[PDB]
């Protein structure tokens, strides 16, 4: 009873927070584009960021009406993946904006900013990979896949 | 009990999230329009986006007071459809904006962006179609359904009144 | 018990969502006016939109402290009516803004936009009428009024 | 039990909605002022609107920790009054803005707008009056009420301390 | 049980509302500064306002993990004090902004606005004093301090 | 029961407030950057502020699905640290902005502002240090902790599968 209650309250706080950030990010970004008015990058990025988020939101329109377990994990992962694509894209977007503001003014600063992004982009890229790998395949293989990837790490910290 | 409780908490998280995003998207889009100040597209899109979203919001003004099951599913669906059209229109809106910001500067970028949207637009359009199809069909079933509930309400006042003497 | 609990939680989600959208719409609209700076229309519209919403909000200041049934339905309908007037006015406002942005630039587009609004404005106008008719009169007459309006529709779908 | 529970959930939805709108209106109005950049009016209004709303917010900082009944009703009323003044000031603020945007361009529109407001302003002013009247009256009752509660708190520590030995 | 439940739900509505307003005020103010671009005042004010609020927010990062009673009242008061400093600073900020907008245009209006602020600033200053006095010292002294300050008032209303 | 309930409601209010402020700060800062349009500082700050906050948000995407205790504390801490860095970066961001708005106009004000920040920055930095120190240490403990939980999950499917015949 406590488990089913906790699971349902988690889907409910996830719903409220998903719609929340998806809409606020999407909006703040659209406004960021009209306020300033590699450029193919800026356009595909803004546009992709808003589309990916609208996807997540719709996944919040449809999880509400809806064995059941396998379908709910596929939808859940599709939501989490669309959302993560949204955070990455929002980051890429701020990179491209430092770029666009600084292009004709200071190249050093712009390049510095887009660069400091790489390690975080790595962590982000990493997780996007786990959710994608989780989407096509079934829980087991990815569960073991995960144990392998973690165990190979257990060997590194000890050596040091 | 757990089922009726979960259903009610789902209409309640759906209410709070619906009003939320409808107002934030609508407001943000209107502001996006005034800030820049093929064009017939931009106007019809902004205006349609805001009208469709206000429709969703009102569906949150009226689900609150509310056999009942068929009528509540129709209304819920009118909400999901208004909401989804709003998402589509918002996406369309950001496309036309890349278009408008980039028109005289770089045609390549705008067209590239407007193109990469197509797979997502496909999924969105698909669902818009299913929801539309659910509405047109029960236009019959529901109207009646609503009559039966309103009648029962007219009858519940008649009984409640017969006891006052 | 479940009924009184559901009614109270509905007044509580309605409170939180009312204040939410009333304030966000009002604000977004005020900002839309200062950012651009038939015109009598634009002014009466912005001004009416913010006033109607502030009304709704105050109805959320006063439902909190408060047979009881008849008074709570009159207040509820006053809130719902002020709120609906707010959504319509927000729509009229975006019409007038396409108008104001496009006036000297492209008349075709502006007129097209204010026009596509009419069927939705019909549905909106319709509901504004039900709430107003509910405000002056008592539940019964409007309940029957509603059955009549719906039954006369039942005859149309069959013929086709 | 249901009554005390409902009362507490009402102070809790009132808290969350108060802070909500106070911050959004205040912020949005400040931004409305800097974006345009009879005038004495515009300044006193923006500044009063933001001060009155910050008052409401603080009343949400202090209701959280809190015979008790009289003091809690006074504070609740100080909140409702600060809140209502904020709504009035926001309305006044949008009027002065139609005024300021339209001044040199079209006098007719601004005056028309500032006029249609009058019935709504009447209702708002009315309530502002009732709440003000509730405050001035119990300035006496409550101060004492607060003393009695603070004393009882001083006494509850004295008893709680008498047992430590 | 009802008491511990109410206390916990109060810390929970305080958390959600604190983060809410702290972030919205901070943001609206930063944006107010870049949109316009005694001045030492404007800078120290904007900067202080955002710092004080970020403090409150972090106090919402740390109250979540955490006799216990004395520590929770010191943290609670630190949060309430940072928050109050934030509201005052937001007000001072709007004063300084009327100032900055009106300086070269109408001195009368600017001075009028910063002036109408004083009585409210008094109430604000008053409360900031109670929370500061509560931070350094223990509950008792401040509790009695409070009874004294209130009782000396009881004598004034009667005379009139 | 009350303890597990309180812990779960704390992760739930922390989730809702985390996503809340992360998105509002990030969006507001990006907009602050485009509106003005030593400089290497401004860019790295805006970009770092938005990246760190998106990190926090994602930590709200992943706490939802989730011995367990050690792994949940590590993740919670990664969240608190990403969140705190975000607050620091936002403060740094408003400093560099006073700097940038005031550079050619009044040097005195900008420097005064950037200076008064130092005590607050001290407290923030301090906590950033404690959280960082909690992370680096358990890099060992947790990875293993996670393995043990994932294994147990691999084992729970194996048992659940052994019964299907
Ligand atoms: Ca601008
Ligand atoms: Zn009779
Ligand atoms: Zn003793
Ligand atoms: Zn087998």
Curated annotation (Swiss-Prot), chains A, C, E:
Chain segments annotated as transmembrane: 21-37, 39-59, 80-100, 109-129
Disulfide bridge positions per record: none
Phenotypic consequence of residue 76 to Q: Decreases store-operated Ca(2+) influx
Site (Confers selective permeability to Ca(2+) ions): 35
Residue intervals on the Extracellular side: 101-108
Family the UniProt entry places it in: Belongs to the Orai family.
Note: In Greek mythology, the 'Orai' are the keepers of the gates of heaven: Eunomia (order or harmony), Dike (justice) and Eirene (peace).
Complex and partners: Hexamer.
The protein's name: Calcium release-activated calcium channel protein 1
Source organism of the structure: Drosophila melanogaster (Fruit fly)
UniProtKB/Swiss-Prot annotation, chains B, D, F:
Residues under site feature: Confers selective permeability to Ca(2+) ions: 35
Topology, Extracellular side: 101-108
Cytoplasmic side: 130-165
Effect in UniProt of substituting residue 76 to Q: Decreases store-operated Ca(2+) influx
Source taxon at top rank: Eukaryota
Subcellular location: Cell membrane
Transmembrane segments: 21-37, 39-59, 80-100, 109-129
Subunit structure: Hexamer.
Note: In Greek mythology, the 'Orai' are the keepers of the gates of heaven: Eunomia (order or harmony), Dike (justice) and Eirene (peace).
Family classification: Belongs to the Orai family.
The protein's role, per its UniProt record: Pore-forming subunit of inward rectifying Ca(2+) release-activated Ca(2+) (CRAC) channels. Assembles in hexameric CRAC channels that mediate Ca(2+) influx upon depletion of endoplasmic reticulum Ca(2+) store and channel activation by Ca(2+) sensor Stim, a process known as store-operated Ca(2+) entry (SOCE). Regulates transcription factor NFAT nuclear import.
Protein name: Calcium release-activated calcium channel protein 1
Covered range of the whole protein: 144 to 334 of 351
């Amino acid at each position: 009873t406590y488990l089913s209650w906790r699971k349902l309250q988690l889907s409910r706080a996830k719903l409220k927070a998903s719609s929340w950030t998806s809409a606020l990010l999407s909006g703040f970004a659209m406004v960021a584009m009209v306020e300033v008015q590699m450029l193919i990058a800026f356009a595909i990025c803004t546009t992709l960021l808003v589309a990916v988020h609208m996807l997540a939101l719709m996944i919040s329109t449809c999880i509400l009406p809806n064995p059941h377990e396998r379908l709910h994990w596929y939808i859940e992962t599709a939501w989490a993946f669309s959302t993560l694509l949204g955070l990455i894209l929002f980051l890429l977007e701020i990179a491209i904006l430092c770029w666009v503001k600084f292009y004709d003014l200071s190249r050093r600063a712009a390049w510095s900013a887009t660069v400091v992004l790489i390690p975080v982009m790595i962590i982000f890229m990493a997780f996007a990979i786990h959710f994608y790998r989780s989407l096509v395949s079934h829980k087991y293989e990815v569960t073991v896949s995960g144990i392998r990837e973690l165990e190979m790490l257990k060997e590194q910290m000890e050596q040091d």
